DNA sequence: AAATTGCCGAAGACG
DNA sequence: CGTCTTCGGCAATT
């Protein structure tokens, strides 16, 4: 049965071809625009991210994530309160000076200009039906809506790229030592880290100047290199069911979110974070044999439910950042989700049949 | 130095 | 399952 669900979740190449062709055209055009000329974003480079490029996108290739990353040398980070994830950016006749607010590089000012330029360029596109979605307060994304004629959304994410050592709140994160190993962990942590203009929610409003850490590049690597054995899922190695379990859990949540508005606070990143923890807890590829899909999915569900119950789901890269804090998600919402998941779990997952 | 190019891994399609 | 294919990511090389 789970196999049948995975078959239906599996993307079709025809859909992939048609969607990628249009998405690539639109993005290539926006990127070229940024790169020329007298703009503060001139040196941005593209990094494709999220579920489509990690091969865990489900049902249809109808949502694409892409970062336009700007390398910003000599930036100084000040942790926003003790959040671990959120930062004020300051510096040691540059283009980003327009976005200053004191010594502080305002995420909001910079994102607003970035968004302005995207919109202007989108207006110039005549051969493709593309519009930009209304702004969502606090979000780092400029979201495009493409009609291909089928609906495809594309999040363009501005990011700052810093080549320095990662902020200390990440020091005991990425606990992959017994799974992917020490060389991998050390090498990953020598790569750049990113900041996206997602504002910290502070009480009733957002702090407009704040940025949030992003490890999209590291996560992409992990998804593509996820076995304790180097040949995991390769042509001369054994297939595991790690990604299949992730797809099923994402589907379960998507389906539940579709019919209950009280689940608005939950997102796929919660599921992705949960399974990162599970892959740490069960590092052996033998624990993710396709023959044991049902059992791996069940263990993931059990862990997720325990996260809910204990109101604790630590960010995988930033252990003191609790995604399931009361500040972020009300206890009642988490109890609501537990009930719905337990029900589906206890009754053969009827929601999988649409 | 911006743009093209092939290489080959991941995984869909098909029998 | 094996073989075929397309798309993405890389970086040399123009
Ligand atoms: N590259 C990137 N993009 C980030 C990001 N953080 C947020 N984004 C982009 O912003 C929008 C909205 O952000 P959000 O915080 O308000 O809500 C995100 C949305 C979902 C997952 O979105 P996704 O990026 O598209 O993930 P997929 O892996 O592609 O999965 P699908 O469901 O299959 O698409 O989760 C929320 N969320 C909460 N916390 C998040 C986080 O820390 N990182 C991410 N990526 N999402 C997070 C979403 C996205 O386009 C970031 O760090 N890097
Ligand atoms: Mg996505
Ligand atoms: Mg998205
Ligand atoms: Zn694998």
CSV table of C-alpha atoms (C1' of nucleotides) and ligand atoms in Angstrom, one decimal:
chain,number,residue,atom,x,y,z
A,1,UNK,CA,0.0,0.0,0.0
A,2,UNK,CA,2.7,2.5,0.9
A,3,UNK,CA,4.3,1.4,-2.3
A,4,UNK,CA,1.1,2.3,-4.2
A,5,UNK,CA,1.1,5.7,-2.6
A,6,UNK,CA,4.7,6.3,-3.5
A,7,UNK,CA,3.9,5.4,-7.1
A,8,UNK,CA,1.2,8.1,-7.2
A,9,UNK,CA,3.5,10.6,-5.5
A,10,UNK,CA,6.3,9.9,-8.0
A,11,UNK,CA,6.8,12.7,-10.5
A,12,UNK,CA,6.3,12.1,-14.2
A,13,UNK,CA,9.1,12.9,-16.6
A,14,UNK,CA,6.7,14.6,-19.0
A,15,UNK,CA,5.6,16.9,-16.3
A,16,UNK,CA,9.2,17.4,-15.2
A,17,UNK,CA,10.3,18.4,-18.7
A,18,UNK,CA,7.5,20.8,-19.3
A,19,UNK,CA,7.8,22.5,-15.9
A,20,UNK,CA,11.6,22.7,-15.9
A,21,UNK,CA,11.7,24.2,-19.3
A,22,UNK,CA,9.5,27.2,-18.3
A,23,UNK,CA,11.0,27.6,-14.8
A,24,UNK,CA,14.6,27.6,-16.2
A,25,UNK,CA,13.6,30.3,-18.8
A,26,UNK,CA,12.1,32.6,-16.2
A,27,UNK,CA,14.8,32.2,-13.6
A,28,UNK,CA,17.6,32.6,-16.2
A,29,UNK,CA,16.0,35.8,-17.3
A,30,UNK,CA,15.6,37.2,-13.8
A,31,UNK,CA,19.2,36.3,-12.9
A,32,UNK,CA,20.6,37.9,-16.0
A,33,UNK,CA,18.6,41.1,-15.0
A,34,UNK,CA,20.1,41.2,-11.6
A,35,UNK,CA,23.6,40.7,-13.0
A,36,UNK,CA,23.3,43.9,-15.2
A,37,UNK,CA,24.2,46.4,-14.2
A,38,UNK,CA,24.0,49.4,-11.9
A,39,UNK,CA,22.2,47.4,-9.3
A,40,UNK,CA,23.2,46.5,-5.7
A,41,UNK,CA,22.7,42.8,-6.6
A,42,UNK,CA,25.1,42.7,-9.5
A,43,UNK,CA,27.2,39.8,-8.3
A,44,UNK,CA,24.4,37.4,-7.3
A,45,UNK,CA,24.8,33.7,-8.2
A,46,UNK,CA,22.1,31.0,-8.4
A,47,UNK,CA,21.8,28.0,-6.2
A,48,UNK,CA,18.8,25.7,-6.7
A,49,UNK,CA,17.3,24.4,-3.4
A,50,UNK,CA,14.5,22.6,-1.8
A,51,UNK,CA,12.5,19.5,-2.6
A,52,UNK,CA,12.5,19.5,-6.4
A,53,UNK,CA,16.3,19.7,-6.6
A,54,UNK,CA,16.7,17.2,-3.7
A,55,UNK,CA,14.3,14.8,-5.5
A,56,UNK,CA,11.8,14.7,-2.6
A,57,UNK,CA,9.2,16.8,-4.3
A,58,UNK,CA,5.9,15.0,-4.3
A,59,UNK,CA,2.8,14.7,-6.5
A,60,UNK,CA,3.6,17.3,-9.1
A,61,UNK,CA,6.6,19.5,-10.1
A,62,UNK,CA,4.6,22.6,-9.2
A,63,UNK,CA,6.9,24.4,-6.7
A,64,UNK,CA,10.5,25.3,-7.2
A,65,UNK,CA,12.9,27.0,-4.8
A,66,UNK,CA,16.0,29.0,-5.9
A,67,UNK,CA,18.4,31.2,-4.1
A,68,UNK,CA,20.1,34.3,-5.6
A,69,UNK,CA,23.1,34.4,-3.3
A,70,UNK,CA,25.2,37.5,-2.8
A,71,UNK,CA,28.7,37.1,-1.4
A,72,UNK,CA,29.2,39.8,1.3
A,73,UNK,CA,32.7,39.9,2.6
A,74,UNK,CA,33.6,41.0,6.1
A,75,UNK,CA,30.2,40.9,7.6
A,76,UNK,CA,29.7,40.8,11.4
A,77,UNK,CA,26.8,38.9,13.0
A,78,UNK,CA,25.1,39.8,16.2
A,79,UNK,CA,22.7,37.1,17.5
A,80,UNK,CA,19.2,38.4,17.8
A,81,UNK,CA,18.4,37.8,21.5
A,82,UNK,CA,19.3,34.1,22.2
A,83,UNK,CA,17.4,32.7,19.2
A,84,UNK,CA,20.4,31.0,17.6
A,85,UNK,CA,18.8,31.3,14.2
A,86,UNK,CA,18.2,35.0,13.8
A,87,UNK,CA,20.9,37.8,13.4
A,88,UNK,CA,21.5,41.4,12.9
A,89,UNK,CA,24.1,42.0,10.2
A,90,UNK,CA,26.7,44.8,10.4
A,91,UNK,CA,30.0,45.5,8.7
A,92,UNK,CA,33.7,45.9,9.3
A,93,UNK,CA,31.1,53.4,-0.9
A,94,UNK,CA,29.5,49.9,-1.3
A,95,UNK,CA,26.2,49.2,-3.1
A,96,UNK,CA,24.4,47.8,0.0
A,97,UNK,CA,24.8,51.1,1.8
A,98,UNK,CA,21.3,52.1,0.6
A,99,UNK,CA,20.0,49.2,2.8
A,100,UNK,CA,21.7,50.4,6.0
A,101,UNK,CA,19.8,51.5,9.0
A,102,UNK,CA,22.5,52.8,11.3
A,103,UNK,CA,25.3,50.2,11.0
A,104,UNK,CA,22.7,47.5,10.5
A,105,UNK,CA,22.0,46.0,7.1
A,106,UNK,CA,18.2,45.9,7.1
A,107,UNK,CA,16.8,42.6,5.7
A,108,UNK,CA,13.5,44.5,4.9
A,109,UNK,CA,15.1,47.3,2.9
A,110,UNK,CA,17.3,45.0,0.9
A,111,UNK,CA,14.5,42.5,0.2
A,112,UNK,CA,12.1,45.3,-0.8
A,113,UNK,CA,14.5,46.5,-3.5
A,114,UNK,CA,15.2,42.9,-4.6
A,115,UNK,CA,11.5,42.4,-4.9
A,116,UNK,CA,11.1,45.7,-6.7
A,117,UNK,CA,13.6,44.6,-9.4
A,118,UNK,CA,12.1,41.2,-9.8
A,119,UNK,CA,8.6,42.7,-10.4
A,120,UNK,CA,10.0,45.1,-13.0
A,121,UNK,CA,11.7,42.3,-14.8
A,122,UNK,CA,8.6,40.0,-14.5
A,123,UNK,CA,6.6,42.9,-16.2
A,124,UNK,CA,9.0,42.6,-19.1
A,125,UNK,CA,8.3,39.0,-19.7
A,126,UNK,CA,5.8,38.7,-22.6
A,127,UNK,CA,6.0,35.1,-23.8
A,128,UNK,CA,5.2,33.5,-20.4
A,129,UNK,CA,2.3,33.9,-18.1
A,130,UNK,CA,4.1,34.8,-14.9
A,131,UNK,CA,3.1,37.2,-12.0
A,132,UNK,CA,4.5,37.8,-8.6
A,133,UNK,CA,2.5,36.8,-5.6
A,134,UNK,CA,1.4,39.4,-3.0
A,135,UNK,CA,4.1,39.9,-0.3
A,136,UNK,CA,3.9,37.7,2.8
A,137,UNK,CA,5.0,39.7,5.8
A,138,UNK,CA,8.2,38.2,7.3
A,139,UNK,CA,8.9,35.8,4.4
A,140,UNK,CA,12.3,35.9,2.6
A,141,UNK,CA,10.7,34.8,-0.7
A,142,UNK,CA,9.6,36.7,-3.8
A,143,UNK,CA,7.2,34.2,-5.1
A,144,UNK,CA,6.4,33.9,-8.8
A,145,UNK,CA,3.2,32.3,-10.1
A,146,UNK,CA,3.7,30.7,-13.5
A,147,UNK,CA,0.8,29.5,-15.7
A,148,UNK,CA,2.3,26.9,-18.1
A,149,UNK,CA,-0.9,26.6,-18.5
A,150,UNK,CA,-0.6,24.5,-15.3
A,151,UNK,CA,0.2,26.4,-12.1
A,152,UNK,CA,3.8,26.4,-11.0
A,153,UNK,CA,5.1,28.6,-8.1
A,154,UNK,CA,8.8,29.6,-7.8
A,155,UNK,CA,10.3,31.1,-4.7
A,156,UNK,CA,13.2,33.4,-5.5
A,157,UNK,CA,15.2,33.7,-2.2
A,158,UNK,CA,17.7,36.5,-1.7
A,159,UNK,CA,20.6,35.3,0.4
A,160,UNK,CA,23.8,36.7,1.8
A,161,UNK,CA,26.7,34.2,1.5
A,162,UNK,CA,29.5,34.3,4.2
A,163,UNK,CA,32.7,32.3,3.8
A,164,UNK,CA,33.7,32.6,7.5
A,165,UNK,CA,33.3,30.0,10.2
A,166,UNK,CA,29.6,29.2,11.0
A,167,UNK,CA,28.0,31.1,13.9
A,168,UNK,CA,28.6,29.4,17.3
A,169,UNK,CA,25.0,28.5,17.8
A,170,UNK,CA,25.7,25.8,15.2
A,171,UNK,CA,28.8,24.4,16.9
A,172,UNK,CA,27.0,21.4,18.3
A,173,UNK,CA,24.6,21.0,15.4
A,174,UNK,CA,24.8,18.7,12.4
A,175,UNK,CA,25.3,15.6,14.6
A,176,UNK,CA,26.3,13.3,11.7
A,177,UNK,CA,29.6,12.0,13.2
A,178,UNK,CA,28.3,8.4,13.5
A,179,UNK,CA,26.4,8.4,10.2
A,180,UNK,CA,28.1,10.5,7.6
A,181,UNK,CA,31.2,10.9,9.7
A,182,UNK,CA,33.7,13.5,10.9
A,183,UNK,CA,35.5,14.3,7.6
A,184,UNK,CA,32.1,15.0,6.0
A,185,UNK,CA,31.0,17.2,8.9
A,186,UNK,CA,34.2,19.1,8.9
A,187,UNK,CA,34.1,19.6,5.2
A,188,UNK,CA,30.5,20.7,5.2
A,189,UNK,CA,31.3,23.3,7.9
A,190,UNK,CA,34.2,24.7,5.9
A,191,UNK,CA,31.6,25.6,3.2
A,192,UNK,CA,29.9,29.1,3.2
A,193,UNK,CA,26.8,29.7,5.3
A,194,UNK,CA,23.8,31.7,4.2
A,195,UNK,CA,21.5,34.3,5.6
A,196,UNK,CA,18.0,34.9,4.2
A,197,UNK,CA,15.9,38.0,4.8
A,198,UNK,CA,13.3,36.1,6.9
A,199,UNK,CA,12.5,38.3,9.9
A,200,UNK,CA,12.2,37.1,13.5
A,201,UNK,CA,8.6,37.3,14.8
A,202,UNK,CA,8.9,39.3,18.0
A,203,UNK,CA,5.6,39.4,19.8
A,204,UNK,CA,2.9,40.9,17.5
A,205,UNK,CA,5.2,42.1,14.8
A,206,UNK,CA,8.4,41.2,12.9
A,207,UNK,CA,11.8,42.7,13.5
A,208,UNK,CA,12.3,44.0,10.0
A,209,UNK,CA,16.1,44.1,10.2
A,210,UNK,CA,16.7,40.5,11.2
A,211,UNK,CA,18.1,37.7,9.0
A,212,UNK,CA,17.9,33.9,9.5
A,213,UNK,CA,20.5,31.3,9.0
A,214,UNK,CA,20.0,29.0,5.9
A,215,UNK,CA,21.7,25.7,5.3
A,216,UNK,CA,19.9,24.8,2.1
A,217,UNK,CA,23.1,24.0,0.4
A,218,UNK,CA,24.2,21.6,3.2
A,219,UNK,CA,20.8,20.0,3.3
A,220,UNK,CA,20.9,19.4,-0.5
A,221,UNK,CA,24.3,17.7,-0.1
A,222,UNK,CA,23.0,15.5,2.7
A,223,UNK,CA,20.0,14.4,0.7
A,224,UNK,CA,22.3,13.4,-2.2
A,225,UNK,CA,24.8,11.8,0.1
A,226,UNK,CA,22.6,10.2,2.8
A,227,UNK,CA,24.0,6.7,3.4
A,228,UNK,CA,26.6,5.5,5.9
A,229,UNK,CA,27.9,3.5,2.9
A,230,UNK,CA,29.3,5.6,0.0
A,231,UNK,CA,27.4,3.5,-2.5
A,232,UNK,CA,24.0,4.0,-0.9
A,233,UNK,CA,21.4,4.5,-3.7
A,234,UNK,CA,24.3,4.4,-6.4
A,235,UNK,CA,24.3,2.2,-9.4
A,236,UNK,CA,26.8,-0.3,-7.8
A,237,UNK,CA,25.2,-0.1,-4.3
A,238,UNK,CA,22.0,-0.8,-2.5
A,239,UNK,CA,18.8,1.2,-2.7
A,240,UNK,CA,17.5,2.5,0.7
A,241,UNK,CA,14.1,3.9,1.6
A,242,UNK,CA,15.2,7.1,3.4
A,243,UNK,CA,13.8,9.5,0.8
A,244,UNK,CA,10.7,7.4,0.3
A,245,UNK,CA,10.0,7.8,4.1
A,246,UNK,CA,10.5,11.5,3.8
A,247,UNK,CA,8.0,11.7,0.9
A,248,UNK,CA,5.3,9.8,2.7
A,249,UNK,CA,5.6,11.9,5.9
A,250,UNK,CA,5.5,15.1,3.7
A,251,UNK,CA,2.4,13.8,1.9
A,252,UNK,CA,0.7,13.0,5.2
A,253,UNK,CA,1.3,16.5,6.4
A,254,UNK,CA,0.3,18.1,3.1
A,255,UNK,CA,-3.0,16.2,3.1
A,256,UNK,CA,-3.8,17.1,6.7
A,257,UNK,CA,-2.9,20.8,6.1
A,258,UNK,CA,-5.2,20.8,3.1
A,259,UNK,CA,-8.3,20.1,5.2
A,260,UNK,CA,-7.5,21.6,8.5
A,261,UNK,CA,-6.7,25.3,8.8
A,262,UNK,CA,-5.6,24.8,12.4
A,263,UNK,CA,-2.5,23.2,11.0
A,264,UNK,CA,-1.3,26.4,9.3
A,265,UNK,CA,1.7,26.7,11.6
A,266,UNK,CA,3.1,23.4,10.5
A,267,UNK,CA,5.4,23.1,7.4
A,268,UNK,CA,7.4,20.5,5.5
A,269,UNK,CA,10.6,21.8,7.1
A,270,UNK,CA,9.3,20.3,10.4
A,271,UNK,CA,9.1,17.0,8.7
A,272,UNK,CA,12.5,17.4,7.1
A,273,UNK,CA,14.1,18.3,10.4
A,274,UNK,CA,12.4,15.3,12.1
A,275,UNK,CA,13.8,12.9,9.5
A,276,UNK,CA,17.3,14.4,9.8
A,277,UNK,CA,17.2,13.4,13.5
A,278,UNK,CA,15.9,10.0,12.6
A,279,UNK,CA,18.8,9.4,10.1
A,280,UNK,CA,21.2,10.3,13.0
A,281,UNK,CA,19.4,8.0,15.4
A,282,UNK,CA,19.4,5.1,12.9
A,283,UNK,CA,22.6,5.6,10.8
A,284,UNK,CA,22.9,2.1,9.4
A,285,UNK,CA,21.8,1.7,5.8
A,286,UNK,CA,20.5,-1.7,6.8
A,287,UNK,CA,17.9,0.2,9.0
A,288,UNK,CA,16.5,1.8,5.8
A,289,UNK,CA,16.2,-1.3,3.6
A,290,UNK,CA,13.3,-0.9,1.1
A,291,UNK,CA,12.0,-4.2,2.5
A,292,UNK,CA,11.3,-2.4,5.8
A,293,UNK,CA,9.6,0.8,4.5
A,294,UNK,CA,6.5,0.3,6.6
A,295,UNK,CA,8.5,0.0,9.8
A,296,UNK,CA,10.7,3.0,8.9
A,297,UNK,CA,7.7,5.1,8.2
A,298,UNK,CA,6.1,4.0,11.4
A,299,UNK,CA,9.3,4.9,13.5
A,300,UNK,CA,9.4,8.3,11.8
A,301,UNK,CA,5.7,8.8,12.7
A,302,UNK,CA,6.4,7.8,16.3
A,303,UNK,CA,9.3,10.2,16.6
A,304,UNK,CA,7.3,13.0,15.1
A,305,UNK,CA,4.5,12.4,17.6
A,306,UNK,CA,6.9,12.4,20.5
A,307,UNK,CA,8.3,15.7,19.2
A,308,UNK,CA,4.7,17.1,19.2
A,309,UNK,CA,3.9,15.7,22.7
A,310,UNK,CA,7.1,17.0,24.3
A,311,UNK,CA,6.8,20.3,22.4
A,312,UNK,CA,10.4,19.9,21.2
A,313,UNK,CA,11.9,19.6,17.7
A,314,UNK,CA,15.3,21.1,17.6
A,315,UNK,CA,16.7,22.7,14.5
A,316,UNK,CA,19.2,20.2,13.0
A,317,UNK,CA,21.9,22.8,12.6
A,318,UNK,CA,21.1,24.9,15.6
A,319,UNK,CA,20.2,22.7,18.6
A,320,UNK,CA,18.9,25.4,20.9
A,321,UNK,CA,16.4,26.6,18.4
A,322,UNK,CA,13.2,24.7,19.1
A,323,UNK,CA,10.9,24.7,16.1
A,324,UNK,CA,8.1,23.4,18.3
A,325,UNK,CA,8.4,26.1,21.0
A,326,UNK,CA,5.3,27.5,22.5
A,327,UNK,CA,6.4,30.9,21.2
A,328,UNK,CA,6.2,29.5,17.6
A,329,UNK,CA,3.4,27.0,17.8
A,330,UNK,CA,0.6,26.9,20.4
A,331,UNK,CA,0.3,23.7,22.4
A,332,UNK,CA,-3.3,23.2,21.2
A,333,UNK,CA,-2.2,23.1,17.6
A,334,UNK,CA,0.4,20.4,18.4
A,335,UNK,CA,-2.2,18.4,20.2
A,336,UNK,CA,-4.6,18.8,17.3
A,337,UNK,CA,-1.9,17.4,14.9
A,338,UNK,CA,-1.1,14.5,17.2
A,339,UNK,CA,-4.8,13.4,17.2
A,340,UNK,CA,-5.0,13.6,13.4
A,341,UNK,CA,-1.8,11.7,12.9
A,342,UNK,CA,-2.7,9.0,15.4
A,343,UNK,CA,-6.0,8.6,13.8
A,344,UNK,CA,-4.5,8.1,10.3
A,345,UNK,CA,-1.9,5.8,11.8
A,346,UNK,CA,-4.5,3.7,13.6
A,347,UNK,CA,-6.8,3.3,10.6
A,348,UNK,CA,-4.6,2.5,7.7
A,349,UNK,CA,-4.1,6.1,6.5
A,350,UNK,CA,-7.4,6.7,4.7
A,351,UNK,CA,-6.2,10.2,3.9
A,352,UNK,CA,-3.6,8.7,1.5
A,353,UNK,CA,-6.6,7.9,-0.7
A,354,UNK,CA,-7.2,11.6,-1.2
B,1,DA,C1',34.9,36.7,-18.0
B,2,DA,C1',30.1,35.5,-19.4
B,3,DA,C1',28.5,31.5,-22.1
B,4,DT,C1',29.0,26.9,-24.0
B,5,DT,C1',30.2,22.2,-23.4
B,6,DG,C1',30.3,17.5,-22.2
B,7,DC,C1',30.5,14.3,-18.3
B,8,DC,C1',27.8,11.4,-15.4
B,9,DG,C1',24.7,10.6,-11.1
B,10,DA,C1',19.7,10.4,-9.8
B,11,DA,C1',15.9,8.5,-11.0
B,12,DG,C1',11.7,8.0,-14.4
B,13,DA,C1',9.9,4.6,-18.2
B,14,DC,C1',9.5,0.4,-19.9
B,15,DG,C1',9.5,-4.1,-20.6
C,1,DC,C1',15.4,-6.4,-12.5
C,2,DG,C1',18.4,-4.1,-16.8
C,3,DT,C1',18.7,-0.6,-20.2
C,4,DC,C1',17.4,3.3,-21.9
C,5,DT,C1',16.6,8.2,-21.3
C,6,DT,C1',16.3,13.4,-19.4
C,7,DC,C1',17.6,16.9,-16.0
C,8,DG,C1',20.8,19.0,-12.9
C,9,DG,C1',25.5,20.2,-11.2
C,10,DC,C1',30.1,21.0,-12.2
C,11,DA,C1',34.0,23.4,-14.0
C,12,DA,C1',37.3,23.7,-17.8
C,13,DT,C1',37.7,26.3,-21.6
C,14,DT,C1',36.5,29.4,-24.9
D,1,LIG,N1,16.6,28.4,0.3
D,1,LIG,C1,15.9,28.7,1.4
D,1,LIG,N2,14.6,29.1,1.4
D,1,LIG,C2,14.0,29.4,2.5
D,1,LIG,C3,14.6,29.2,3.7
D,1,LIG,N3,13.7,29.5,4.6
D,1,LIG,C4,12.5,29.9,4.0
D,1,LIG,N4,12.7,29.7,2.7
D,1,LIG,C5,11.8,30.0,1.6
D,1,LIG,O1,10.9,30.8,2.1
D,1,LIG,C6,9.7,30.3,2.0
D,1,LIG,C7,8.9,30.7,3.2
D,1,LIG,O2,9.7,30.5,4.4
D,1,LIG,P1,9.0,30.1,5.6
D,1,LIG,O3,9.8,30.1,6.8
D,1,LIG,O4,8.0,31.2,5.9
D,1,LIG,O5,8.3,28.7,5.5
D,1,LIG,C8,9.0,27.6,5.1
D,1,LIG,C9,8.3,26.9,4.0
D,1,LIG,C10,8.3,25.4,4.2
D,1,LIG,C11,9.2,24.7,3.2
D,1,LIG,O6,9.4,25.4,2.0
D,1,LIG,P2,10.3,24.9,1.0
D,1,LIG,O7,11.4,25.8,1.1
D,1,LIG,O8,9.8,25.1,-0.3
D,1,LIG,O9,10.8,23.4,1.2
D,1,LIG,P3,10.8,22.2,0.4
D,1,LIG,O10,12.0,21.5,0.9
D,1,LIG,O11,11.2,22.6,-1.0
D,1,LIG,O12,9.7,21.4,0.6
D,1,LIG,P4,8.3,21.4,-0.2
D,1,LIG,O13,7.4,21.4,0.8
D,1,LIG,O14,8.3,20.2,-0.8
D,1,LIG,O15,8.4,22.5,-1.0
D,1,LIG,O16,8.9,25.3,5.5
D,1,LIG,C12,9.0,26.5,6.1
D,1,LIG,N5,10.2,26.6,6.9
D,1,LIG,C13,10.3,26.9,8.1
D,1,LIG,N6,11.5,27.0,8.5
D,1,LIG,C14,12.2,26.8,7.4
D,1,LIG,C15,13.5,26.8,7.2
D,1,LIG,O17,14.1,27.0,8.2
D,1,LIG,N7,14.0,26.5,6.0
D,1,LIG,C16,13.1,26.3,5.0
D,1,LIG,N8,13.6,26.1,3.8
D,1,LIG,N9,11.9,26.4,5.2
D,1,LIG,C17,11.4,26.6,6.4
D,1,LIG,C18,9.9,28.9,1.9
D,1,LIG,C19,11.2,28.8,1.1
D,1,LIG,O18,10.9,29.0,-0.2
D,1,LIG,C20,15.8,28.8,3.7
D,1,LIG,O19,16.4,28.7,4.7
D,1,LIG,N10,16.5,28.6,2.6
D,2,LIG,MG1,9.7,23.8,-2.0
D,3,LIG,MG1,8.9,27.0,-1.2
D,4,LIG,ZN1,20.2,5.5,-0.1
